[PDB]
């Protein structure tokens, strides 16, 4: 038979054993729900590398028609796809204690919600007298609609700074866990994957960049709730660190779970990265990493690469949070690409 994944009982080892079988030529996997039955061709994502505290995390793609991606570490796995245009994540941690802590973490915002409603946005998956949770299913769009939280945004999240290569250039995206913050691996890896993929989708840019995210902790924490103050302070702290000398031409993100003052989701120095002139830790920003707000790091990385705000509410670079993950602006596409070495004579 074709290999299949039962989404009604999907566990970490389900996802690990399936993805670990994906050879260099890809593999067909059936995504199997009740009568719902999508077949996807899965491949290794060779564009992007990720360590989280030196733990190696691998990405997997479907074809474009599949609208499907995976994340796999030793500790956790993620499947994300779209059904009727809604982002749905299956999240499964390997260790039972961590999986329960994750399931209680995602259930707690619904503690006042009617259970009838809740099963649309958030659902525990159990092992086939107390049940064992092997994964959770989140529909963030439905989640937002059920919890009806106040909207966040990015209104003022950028400050004015300060041939085809034979192989892509490696750009490190060095992410730093703010001192004191509680950060979960499935949520950070999802931001990283989305950030990198929003770039590769533009002008065939994988020929020019292969992003390499790493994550460690920093002693720095924001002195206030003010995002500008925080980024100013964070850039200063990169120049102070001797453990970072020699790496002033990479990209730097301070990361946390919550937002800053005025529901601001992130901040970065505008148009501060260029593959020829990057210097002095200028290509730095901050980013929220919570699951309800996909695409934030992508949005901030776009700014770092020159992309401006746009007036389409389906664009990644809309000034209000939208959930959307793709650059729609031809102006932004050209300048981001230009900053990574691309010219129109190169084609896509």
């Amino acid at each position, epitope marked *: 038979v074709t290999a299949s994944i039962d989404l009604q009982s999907v566990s970490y080892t389900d996802l690990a054993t399936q993805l670990n079988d994906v050879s260099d030529f890809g593999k067909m996997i059936i995504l199997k729900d009740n009568g719902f039955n999508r077949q996807v061709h899965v491949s290794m994502d060779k564009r992007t590398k990720i360590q989280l505290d030196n733990e190696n995390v691998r990405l997997f793609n479907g074809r474009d028609k599949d609208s499907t991606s995976f994340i796999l570490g030793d500790e956790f796995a993620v499947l994300r796809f779209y059904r009727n245009g809604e982002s749905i994540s299956y999240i499964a941690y390997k260790e039972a204690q961590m999986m329960n802590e994750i399931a209680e973490f995602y259930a707690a915002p619904f503690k006042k919600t009617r259970a009838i409603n809740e099963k649309e946005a958030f659902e525990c998956i159990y092992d086939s007298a107390g049940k064992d949770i092997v994964s959770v299913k989140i529909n963030i769009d439905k989640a937002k609609k059920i919890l009806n939280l106040p909207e966040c945004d990015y209104i003022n999240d950028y400050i004015k700074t300060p041939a085809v290569p034979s192989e892509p250039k490696t750009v490190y995206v060095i992410c730093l866990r703010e001192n004191g913050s509680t950060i979960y691996p499935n949520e950070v890896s999802a931001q990283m994957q989305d950030a990198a993929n929003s770039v590769y989708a533009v002008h065939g840019l994988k020929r020019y960049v292969n992003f390499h995210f790493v994550l460690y902790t920093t002693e720095y924490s924001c002195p206030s709730g003010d995002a500008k103050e925080g980024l100013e302070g964070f850039t200063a702290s990169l120049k102070s660190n001797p453990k970072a000398e020699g790496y002033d031409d990479q990209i730097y993100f301070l990361i946390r779970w919550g937002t800053w003052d005025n529901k601001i989701l992130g901040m970065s120095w505008f148009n501060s990265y260029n593959v020829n002139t990057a210097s002095d830790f200028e290509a730095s920003g901050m980013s929220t990493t919570q699951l309800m707000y996909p695409g934030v790091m992508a949005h901030e990385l776009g700014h770092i690469l020159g992309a*401006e*705000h*746009t*007036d*389409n509410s*389906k*664009d990644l670079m809309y000034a209000t949070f939208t959930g959307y993950l793709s650059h*729609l*602006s*031809e*102006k*932004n*596409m*050209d300048i981001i690409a230009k900053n990574l070495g691309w010219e129109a004579a190169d084609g896509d």
Partner: nanobody, 120 residues
Framework: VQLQESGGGLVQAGGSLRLSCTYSGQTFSAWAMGWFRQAPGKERETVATINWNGERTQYADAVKGRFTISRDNAKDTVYLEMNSLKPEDTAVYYC??????????????WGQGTQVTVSS
């Protein structure tokens, strides 16, 4: 975001019109722009599309050599200059902002549309 065409109306064959399309919105320069047309009982067709910075253009075969698309990012307006009009150029003419590139993108915000009638 709001788009307004203007400059249409009656014109005799061989004459000339100059449509203008005004963009009320904050990031006119973010988007490629296009002109489209639809005659009664006929499918809509693309007439011309233009770069976000006006430097690159693409024309439908039936209008190449006769129509010129331009944009003024300085005034937030896109233009269609139409010369040597033929009866078959009669249609409602719409402008639109588009997602993606000027060559493979998709119109998203449409104008009211202006009427162009070429007589014989």
């Amino acid at each position: 975001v709001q788009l307004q065409e203007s400059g249409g109306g009656l014109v005799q064959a061989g004459g000339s019109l100059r449509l203008s399309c005004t963009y009320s919105g904050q990031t006119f320069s973010a988007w490629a722009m296009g002109w489209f047309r639809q005659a009664p009982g006929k499918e809509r067709e693309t007439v011309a599309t233009i770069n976000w910075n006006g430097e690159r253009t693409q024309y439908a075969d039936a209008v190449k050599g006769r129509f010129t698309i331009s944009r003024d990012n300085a005034k937030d307006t896109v233009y269609l200059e139409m010369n040597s009009l033929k009866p078959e150029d009669t249609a409602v003419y719409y402008c639109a902002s588009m997602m993606g590139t000027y060559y493979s993108g998709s119109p998203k915000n449409w104008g009211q549309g202006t009427q162009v009638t070429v007589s014989s």
